[PDB]
Design an enzyme around this catalytic site. Structure first.
Site, PDB file in Angstrom:
ATOM      1  N   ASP A 168       0.839  -1.205   0.000  1.00  0.00           N
ATOM      2  CA  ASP A 168       0.000   0.000   0.000  1.00  0.00           C
ATOM      3  C   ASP A 168       0.871   1.251   0.000  1.00  0.00           C
ATOM      4  O   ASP A 168       0.618   2.187   0.761  1.00  0.00           O
ATOM      5  CB  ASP A 168      -0.939   0.042   1.220  1.00  0.00           C
ATOM      6  CG  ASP A 168      -2.170   0.938   0.991  1.00  0.00           C
ATOM      7  OD1 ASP A 168      -3.054   0.963   1.874  1.00  0.00           O
ATOM      8  OD2 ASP A 168      -2.269   1.608  -0.068  1.00  0.00           O
ATOM      9  N   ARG A 172      -0.298   8.876   1.532  1.00  0.00           N
ATOM     10  CA  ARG A 172      -1.149   8.814   2.705  1.00  0.00           C
ATOM     11  C   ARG A 172      -0.551   7.877   3.747  1.00  0.00           C
ATOM     12  O   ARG A 172      -0.844   8.009   4.933  1.00  0.00           O
ATOM     13  CB  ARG A 172      -2.558   8.340   2.330  1.00  0.00           C
ATOM     14  CG  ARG A 172      -2.578   6.971   1.681  1.00  0.00           C
ATOM     15  CD  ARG A 172      -3.982   6.443   1.460  1.00  0.00           C
ATOM     16  NE  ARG A 172      -3.919   5.206   0.683  1.00  0.00           N
ATOM     17  CZ  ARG A 172      -3.788   5.171  -0.636  1.00  0.00           C
ATOM     18  NH1 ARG A 172      -3.727   6.307  -1.319  1.00  0.00           N
ATOM     19  NH2 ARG A 172      -3.679   4.003  -1.264  1.00  0.00           N
ATOM     20  N   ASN A 173       0.286   6.934   3.305  1.00  0.00           N
ATOM     21  CA  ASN A 173       0.910   5.981   4.218  1.00  0.00           C
ATOM     22  C   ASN A 173       2.376   6.282   4.494  1.00  0.00           C
ATOM     23  O   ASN A 173       3.201   5.375   4.645  1.00  0.00           O
ATOM     24  CB  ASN A 173       0.759   4.543   3.704  1.00  0.00           C
ATOM     25  CG  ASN A 173      -0.665   4.042   3.799  1.00  0.00           C
ATOM     26  OD1 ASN A 173      -1.334   4.258   4.808  1.00  0.00           O
ATOM     27  ND2 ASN A 173      -1.135   3.361   2.753  1.00  0.00           N
ATOM     28  N   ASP A 186       2.892  -0.510   8.560  1.00  0.00           N
ATOM     29  CA  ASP A 186       1.630  -1.108   8.162  1.00  0.00           C
ATOM     30  C   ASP A 186       0.543  -0.339   8.915  1.00  0.00           C
ATOM     31  O   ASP A 186       0.431  -0.458  10.136  1.00  0.00           O
ATOM     32  CB  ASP A 186       1.582  -2.580   8.560  1.00  0.00           C
ATOM     33  CG  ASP A 186       0.416  -3.300   7.932  1.00  0.00           C
ATOM     34  OD1 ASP A 186      -0.652  -2.668   7.822  1.00  0.00           O
ATOM     35  OD2 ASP A 186       0.563  -4.481   7.555  1.00  0.00           O
TER      36      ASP A 186
HETATM   37  C1  LIG Z   1      -3.864   5.518   9.251  1.00  0.00           C
HETATM   38  C2  LIG Z   1      -3.413   6.854   9.842  1.00  0.00           C
HETATM   39  C3  LIG Z   1      -1.887   6.940   9.825  1.00  0.00           C
HETATM   40  C4  LIG Z   1      -1.382   8.282  10.387  1.00  0.00           C
HETATM   41  N1  LIG Z   1      -2.093   8.721  11.629  1.00  0.00           N
HETATM   42  C5  LIG Z   1      -1.516   9.774  12.366  1.00  0.00           C
HETATM   43  C6  LIG Z   1      -2.048  11.102  12.187  1.00  0.00           C
HETATM   44  C7  LIG Z   1      -1.456  12.225  12.819  1.00  0.00           C
HETATM   45  C8  LIG Z   1      -0.313  12.062  13.654  1.00  0.00           C
HETATM   46  C9  LIG Z   1       0.340  13.257  14.301  1.00  0.00           C
HETATM   47  O1  LIG Z   1      -0.229  13.450  15.593  1.00  0.00           O
HETATM   48  C10 LIG Z   1       0.225  10.746  13.850  1.00  0.00           C
HETATM   49  C11 LIG Z   1      -0.367   9.597  13.218  1.00  0.00           C
HETATM   50  N2  LIG Z   1       0.079   8.253  13.407  1.00  0.00           N
HETATM   51  C12 LIG Z   1       1.184   7.703  14.031  1.00  0.00           C
HETATM   52  O2  LIG Z   1       2.084   8.339  14.598  1.00  0.00           O
HETATM   53  C13 LIG Z   1       1.187   6.238  13.957  1.00  0.00           C
HETATM   54  C14 LIG Z   1       2.122   5.303  14.372  1.00  0.00           C
HETATM   55  C15 LIG Z   1       1.603   4.019  14.054  1.00  0.00           C
HETATM   56  C16 LIG Z   1       0.382   4.236  13.474  1.00  0.00           C
HETATM   57  C17 LIG Z   1      -0.585   3.329  12.963  1.00  0.00           C
HETATM   58  N3  LIG Z   1      -1.367   2.574  12.545  1.00  0.00           N
HETATM   59  O3  LIG Z   1       0.109   5.577  13.405  1.00  0.00           O
HETATM   60  C18 LIG Z   1      -3.490   8.309  11.947  1.00  0.00           C
HETATM   61  C19 LIG Z   1      -3.908   6.980  11.288  1.00  0.00           C
END
Ligand SMILES: CC1CCN(c2ccc(CO)cc2NC(=O)c2ccc(C#N)o2)CC1
Length: 311
Positions: A168, A172-173, A186
């Site tokens: 994927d 976005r990832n 993942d």
């Molecule tokens: C599918 C999206 C992936 C990114 N997402 C974050 C958004 C914003 C911020 C900043 O505050 C951080 C995010 N994510 C992480 O740091 C993290 C580590 C592991 C995972 C998993 N799954 O998401 C939310 C879910």
């Protein structure tokens, strides 16, 4: 599917698939020394939340972390996938551009997978904000885009050396952590795939078609070379500051025929010719003619050197 998976091969050698065999109690962490914070994001089967881990790892530091877990919606097949992800991450080893596993809570309650936290969020939104700003009234530089590209290429190179496919690859990832360093992981379980139109219905599944190599779409074949194609699409997103791939083109019969026939997106506004050459290379119809992530890493390094030589 769209989850990380260790495949069979023998440069890299697959001595064992971590998926088979139970899990390694080597990552267990006190379910109590974890205070759940804000919900970073949530999907159909689960979610990931921010939290503070007290006494995590050798250095009992109280670092901020991310905790993935399941929902009521999750059944057996869903629980297995989380454990499998856990098994894969416990076997991959650490890397600077991967959202590393830090611990897990598999006893005394629902399974919790603790990984590194990325303070700046996902790359796609970071890019989109800068572009919106371009219509001015921090400004990304070619070096900035090259670093993002390099960091991800390095993460993918690491995965490839472990015979691990991503499946994927998309902006976005890609998450951004301290120093705005890019990391991949993942994120499926926390991905709201059912309600994201970027994931096309294929009967029994939802797939990110616009990011997929032809063999994966038409022959259900997924290899490291498939990920390379997807990486090419990611590069296009990076250097166009977040436009949606194949702008204005809908996923249907026409689309498939286009990609099948060799159609390739046009050079993005901010991509130098050399970078577009990477995209074009990644988009070779024949998987064997695409470059490897290491070849991409070394070429990108050369572009970073020349850019610096220029100053
Ligand atoms: C599918 C999206 C992936 C990114 N997402 C974050 C958004 C914003 C911020 C900043 O505050 C951080 C995010 N994510 C992480 O740091 C993290 C580590 C592991 C995972 C998993 N799954 O998401 C939310 C879910």
């Amino acid at each position: 599917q769209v989850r990380w998976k260790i495949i069979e091969s023998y440069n890299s050698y697959t001595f064992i698939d971590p998926t088979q065999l139970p899990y390694n109690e080597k990552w267990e962490f006190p379910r109590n020394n974890l205070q759940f914070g804000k919900t970073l994001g949530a999907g159909a089967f689960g979610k990931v939340v921010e939290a503070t881990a007290f006494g995590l790892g050798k250095e009992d530091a109280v670092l901020k972390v991310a905790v993935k877990m399941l929902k009521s919606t999750a059944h057996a097949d869903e629980k297995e996938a989380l454990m499998s992800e856990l098994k894969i991450m416990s076997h991959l080893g650490q890397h600077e551009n991967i959202v590393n596993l830090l611990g897990a809570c598999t006893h005394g309650g629902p399974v919790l997978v603790i990984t590194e936290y990325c303070c700046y969020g996902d790359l796609l939104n970071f890019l989109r904000r800068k572009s919106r700003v371009l219509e001015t009234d921090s400004t990304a530089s070619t070096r900035d885009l090259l670093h993002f590209s390099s960091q991800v290429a390095q993460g993918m190179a690491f995965l490839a050396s472990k015979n691990c496919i991503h499946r994927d690859v998309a902006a976005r990832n890609v998450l951004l952590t301290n120093g705005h360093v890019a990391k991949i992981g993942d994120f499926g379980l926390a991905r709201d795939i059912m309600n994201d139109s970027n994931y096309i219905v294929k009967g029994n599944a939802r797939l990110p078609v616009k990011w997929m190599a032809p063999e994966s779409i038409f022959d259900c074949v997924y290899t490291v070379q498939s990920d390379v194609w997807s990486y090419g699409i990611l590069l296009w997103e990076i250097f166009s500051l977040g436009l949606n791939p194949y702008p204005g083109i809908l996923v249907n019969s026409k689309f498939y025929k286009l990609v099948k026939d060799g159609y390739q997106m046009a050079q993005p506004a901010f991509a130098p010719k050399n970078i577009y050459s990477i995209m074009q290379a990644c988009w070779a119809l024949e998987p064997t003619h695409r470059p490897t992530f290491q070849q991409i890493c070394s070429f990108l390094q050369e572009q970073a050197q020349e850019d610096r030589r220029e100053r």
